[PDB]
Design a protein around this nucleic acid. Structure first.
Ligand SMILES: Nc1nc2c(ncn2[C@@H]2O[C@H](COP(=O)(O)OP(=O)(O)O)[C@@H](O)[C@H]2O)c(=O)[nH]1
Ligand SMILES: [Mg+2]
Ligand SMILES: [Mg+2]
Ligand SMILES: [Mg+2]
Ligand SMILES: [Mg+2]
Ligand SMILES: [Mg+2]
Ligand SMILES: [Mg+2]
Ligand SMILES: [Mg+2]
Ligand SMILES: [Mg+2]
Ligand SMILES: [Mg+2]
Ligand SMILES: [Mg+2]
Ligand SMILES: [Mg+2]
Ligand SMILES: [Mg+2]
Ligand SMILES: [Mg+2]
Ligand SMILES: [Mg+2]
Ligand SMILES: [Mg+2]
Ligand SMILES: [Mg+2]
Ligand SMILES: [Mg+2]
Ligand SMILES: [Mg+2]
Ligand SMILES: [Mg+2]
Ligand SMILES: [Mg+2]
Ligand SMILES: [Mg+2]
Ligand SMILES: [Mg+2]
Ligand SMILES: [Mg+2]
Ligand SMILES: [Mg+2]
Ligand SMILES: [Mg+2]
Ligand SMILES: [Mg+2]
Ligand SMILES: [Mg+2]
Ligand SMILES: [Mg+2]
Ligand SMILES: [Mg+2]
Ligand SMILES: [Mg+2]
Ligand SMILES: [Zn+2]
Lengths: 117, 135, 38, 472
RNA sequence: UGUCGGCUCAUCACAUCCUGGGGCUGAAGCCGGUCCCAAGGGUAUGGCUGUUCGCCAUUUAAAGUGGUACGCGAGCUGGG
RNA sequence: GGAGGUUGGCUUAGAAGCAGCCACCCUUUAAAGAAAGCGUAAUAGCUCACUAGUCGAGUCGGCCUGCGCGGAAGAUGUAAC
């Protein structure tokens, strides 16, 4: 399994991206096939949107630089951090139509300039 | 639904297409022309896969995914049979210029971030054949 | 059922149990892995 | 006015449907029914085995055929064997689901199961009609009787009434004929196959004496000198010397044609005499049938097309042999041997019949046949058969079996096959053979012995043992 | 302290031949293979040979394996 | 959830992770073996390895050692304190 050295290694990668990221959203991924997720990651990669999946207990540790601290109340159940690197917002239109068609995830919540939304 | 691998323009009723006549009965002579409708594109012979989506009765659909990245390396490297033992019994040779095009002709159906990664996909497939890649 | 003196698991689903002072192997996957004595 | 044959799987309704249809509107072999859309007749004995035997004699005593399946337990292997027997002859197939009078009343698996046999229905592709009927309940006579004619849409002319006598024989009890062309006024001299006579008795199906024979109607003639075969042909002559001369010419020509067939129709004479080589497959298991079918479906394009016309699982029943004879085909037994009647048909006629054990061997042989460069007389020979009569297995080494050795010599220097129901089960070598508990090492012909085979003890009462040598 | 075989009469063990109850099966059915529990009751007639045995012929649900001074001559025989 | 190059190359009538031989890379990833098993004539189909959730405090295996348990069936009657 994972090790303690790697556990604090993976929080930095989330912490490094979250330091400069502007718009971030949280979503679930249960029920959607890994085939249907290659298309989404293709769309985000074309639009400069960074999508990742981390442990809930590591997300709270990673999100500490006063970036998206207003999200630590909905780190329950599966998570998928989708931070927007350019054109703040961005990774919400992709999630807007993907949720409709695929019939999966409630897109949890979203954060923007300390707004829980 | 049903899928297979047929040649580049013949697709005649034959052991390439044996159970299309049993999957839903299906007028298979119709599918033969339909496959021939997109014709050769690379002259007959080069195997090309299909995804035949079958519906109520014998409704068709037809995509022609690509041309598999095994006949392509044999063509660009001369011989038409790969090694019976890689590591030692090398059979061919290629260069990072051929690998650029053979990936650029499969930029669909590789799901690789940038094309630099799409090459390392192909060279990994070469190293099982017996080819050796270099400049 | 197979009666031996050396009873032991044959796959993942096998199960060593002791019932009325006899060692037995019961397997949900294959009914051929049942064993007694041992 | 076609000539219908009922045809289907056992215990599915053929005799029931025939008897019902006859009852709505004394067994000789044929019967006929008059309906406002037009008179239609049927032949008494159903099943492919009887329909193809007479066809194997140029008779073509059929126009339309109907499959009866059941809503429960639908397409069964003999159903698809029948549809093979009907396509090979070549007649449109009109289907009918019979047992719709049951709780299991879903003609939905029947349609899409029988469709993967080139009997595709109308709502699917438009090729062959489908109809629910029920002989027990009765609901379905109308639709079937309309469809039997609506699917008789060739010109269907000829059968010119005023014409010389021309019919085909059916039941050689005394006989009957279902005339194709002409009229058969009683008293006229007749040539019925290799046979001569005059019409004294002209009984009908119901037995009412008549004197006029319809265009496509049955009638039982009595007065002939004896009994002809079951698929021969009858016409009208005037001179007894003419009848005898024609009979002797027919004798000679038949004795010539049997030799010509047994010569040119061999696998060895394929390329010389297109021509679309026909094969007739029989395999031990369904997998080794499907694989080898798909292998021989494509072999050569611009010269000769090889198309399999049969294909079943089990021994080589005589229906298979008659089909191969009628279609001028080549038998093939992959791990299955022939019955008695198959041997009878094989010996009388030609019809090359060769056995095999390796999938590759049949492909190799057909390649060399299509190129005409095949060798002759290869792949082993039969040097002895024994029939197992009793199996006793002592609890020290239990494998011994009593055998009556029939027509050959069984030894220890040759490997064997053991076979049940004309299907092989095991191919190994001898372990022991001993008479009077004494280990003799050579058993004669017609003798009796005790055989035990190495690393196989399952022989039963009623098997057979063949011993063979890979001779080259 | 009379030694083979036959006859008459038996008695016990179970490492069960049949009948009885089960597990697995390369157990579809009818048949089987193998292992477990079970000793209540049954468990051939003849041809050859002094034979036990054996091989044959025809049966039977089956024609069990052993201990008892290789049971049994103050119970018989006397072929070896 | 357990994927894409990909029926990896050879062989083979057919060898598609799963007859046999050689390799055993790469891509998107939280993770997914050029596959541990069942299946097909070859496919198809079903599990596993692995990872993300849920549940909140113990859990997993080996070494030394005391006493026990199976392996363990006989002939007159318990009958090997
Ligand atoms: N329930 C039901 N039984 C039928 C029907 N038709 C026939 N049967 C029964 O199915 C059997 C068919 O046997 P049959 O056709 O005469 O034998 P075959 O000639 O060898 O096919 C008969 O015993 C009938 O009683 C039907 O429509 N419904
Ligand atoms: Mg034991
Ligand atoms: Mg108990
Ligand atoms: Mg039935
Ligand atoms: Mg006692
Ligand atoms: Mg016991
Ligand atoms: Mg017993
Ligand atoms: Mg018993
Ligand atoms: Mg029992
Ligand atoms: Mg049993
Ligand atoms: Mg006892
Ligand atoms: Mg007793
Ligand atoms: Mg007793
Ligand atoms: Mg009692
Ligand atoms: Mg005796
Ligand atoms: Mg004597
Ligand atoms: Mg003794
Ligand atoms: Mg004794
Ligand atoms: Mg004594
Ligand atoms: Mg004794
Ligand atoms: Mg005494
Ligand atoms: Mg005495
Ligand atoms: Mg004495
Ligand atoms: Mg005394
Ligand atoms: Mg005395
Ligand atoms: Mg006395
Ligand atoms: Mg004397
Ligand atoms: Mg004496
Ligand atoms: Mg201990
Ligand atoms: Mg002990
Ligand atoms: Mg006792
Ligand atoms: Zn098990």
């Amino acid at each position: 399994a994972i090790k303690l050295e790697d556990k604090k290694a993976i929080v930095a990668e989330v912490n490094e991206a979250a330091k400069a990221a502007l718009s971030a959203v949280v979503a679930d991924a249960r029920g959607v096939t890994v085939g249907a997720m290659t298309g989404l990651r293709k769309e985000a990669r074309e639009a400069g949107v960074y999508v990742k999946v981390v442990r809930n207990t590591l997300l709270k540790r990673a999100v500490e630089g006063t970036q998206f601290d207003v999200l630590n109340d909905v780190f329950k159940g599966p998570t998928l951090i989708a931070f927007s690197n350019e054109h703040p917002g961005a990774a919400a239109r992709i999630f807007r139509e993907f949720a409709k068609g695929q019939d999966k995830f409630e897109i949890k919540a979203a954060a923007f300039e300390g707004q829980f939304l | 639904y049903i899928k297979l691998q047929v040649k580049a323009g013949q697709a005649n009723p034959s052991p390439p297409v044996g159970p299309a006549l049993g999957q839903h009965g299906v007028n298979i002579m119709e599918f033969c022309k339909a496959f021939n409708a997109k014709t050769q594109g690379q002259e007959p012979g080069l195997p090309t896969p299909v995804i035949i989506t079958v519906y109520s009765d014998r409704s068709f659909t037809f995509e022609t995914k690509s041309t598999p990245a095994a006949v392509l390396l044999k063509k660009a490297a001369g011989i038409t049979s790969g090694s019976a033992r890689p590591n030692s019994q090398k059979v061919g040779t290629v260069t990072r210029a051929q690998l650029e095009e053979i990936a650029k002709t499969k930029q669909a159906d590789l799901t690789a971030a940038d094309l630099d990664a799409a090459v390392r996909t192909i060279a990994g497939s070469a190293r099982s054949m017996g080819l050796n890649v270099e400049g | 059922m197979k009666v031996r003196a050396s009873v032991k698991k044959l796959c993942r689903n096998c199960k060593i149990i002791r019932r009325d002072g006899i060692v037995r192997v019961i397997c949900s996957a294959e009914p051929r892995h049942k064993q007694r004595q041992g | 006015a076609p000539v219908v044959t009922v045809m289907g799987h056992v215990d599915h309704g053929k005799t029931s449907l025939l008897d019902y249809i006859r009852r709505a509107k004394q067994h000789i072999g044929a019967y006929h029914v008059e309906t406002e859309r037009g008179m239609v007749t049927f032949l008494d004995t159903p099943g492919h085995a009887a329909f193809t035997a007479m066809r194997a004699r140029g008779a073509q005593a059929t126009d339309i055929v109907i499959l009866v399946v059941a809503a429960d337990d639908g397409v069964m292997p003999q159903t698809q064997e029948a549809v093979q027997h009907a396509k090979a002859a070549g007649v449109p197939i009109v289907v009918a689901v019979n047992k719709i009078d049951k709780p299991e009343a879903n003609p939905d698996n029947i349609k899409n199961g029988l469709a993967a046999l080139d009997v595709i229905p109308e709502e699917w592709g438009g090729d062959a009609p489908f109809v629910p009927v029920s002989a027990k309940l009765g609901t379905g006579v109308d639709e079937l009787l309309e469809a039997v004619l609506l699917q008789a849409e060739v010109l269907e002319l000829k059968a010119t009434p005023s014409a010389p006598g021309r019919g085909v024989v059916v039941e050689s009890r005394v006989a009957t004929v279902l005339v194709q062309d002409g009229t058969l006024r009683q008293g006229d001299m007749v040539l019925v196959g290799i046979n001569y006579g005059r019409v004294r008795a002209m009984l009908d199906e119901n037995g009412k004496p008549i004197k006029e024979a319809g265009p496509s109607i049955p009638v039982e003639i009595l007065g002939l000198d004896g009994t002809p075969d079951a698929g021969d042909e009858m016409t009208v002559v005037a001179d007894e010397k003419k009848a005898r001369e024609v009979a002797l010419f027919r004798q000679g020509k038949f004795r010539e044609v049997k030799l010509a067939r047994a010569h040119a129709g061999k696998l060895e004479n394929i390329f010389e005499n297109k021509k679309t080589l026909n094969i007739v497959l029989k395999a031990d298991v369904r997998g080794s049938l499907e694989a080898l079918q798909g292998s021989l479906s494509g072999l050569g394009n611009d010269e000769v097309q090889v198309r399999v016309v049969g294909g079943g699982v089990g021994g080589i029943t005589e229906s298979d042999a008659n089909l191969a004879l009628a279609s001028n085909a080549v038998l093939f037994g992959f791990n299955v041997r022939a019955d008695a009647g198959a041997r009878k048909i094989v010996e009388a006629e030609g019809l090359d019949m060769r056995y095999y054990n390796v999938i590759y061997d049949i492909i190799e042989d057909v390649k060399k046949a299509l190129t005409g460069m095949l060798g002759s007389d290869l792949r082993e020979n039969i040097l002895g058969i024994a029939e197992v009569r009793d199996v006793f297995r002592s609890p020290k080494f239990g494998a011994i079996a009593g055998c009556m050795v029939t027509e050959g010599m069984v030894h220890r220097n040759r490997p064997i096959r053991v076979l049940r129901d004309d299907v092989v089960i095991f191919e190994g070598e001898l372990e022991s053979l001993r008479r009077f508990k004494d280990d003799v090492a050579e058993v004669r012909a017609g003798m009796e012995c005790g055989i035990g085979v190495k690393s196989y003890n399952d022989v039963k009462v009623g098997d057979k043992i063949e011993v063979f040598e890979k001779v080259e």
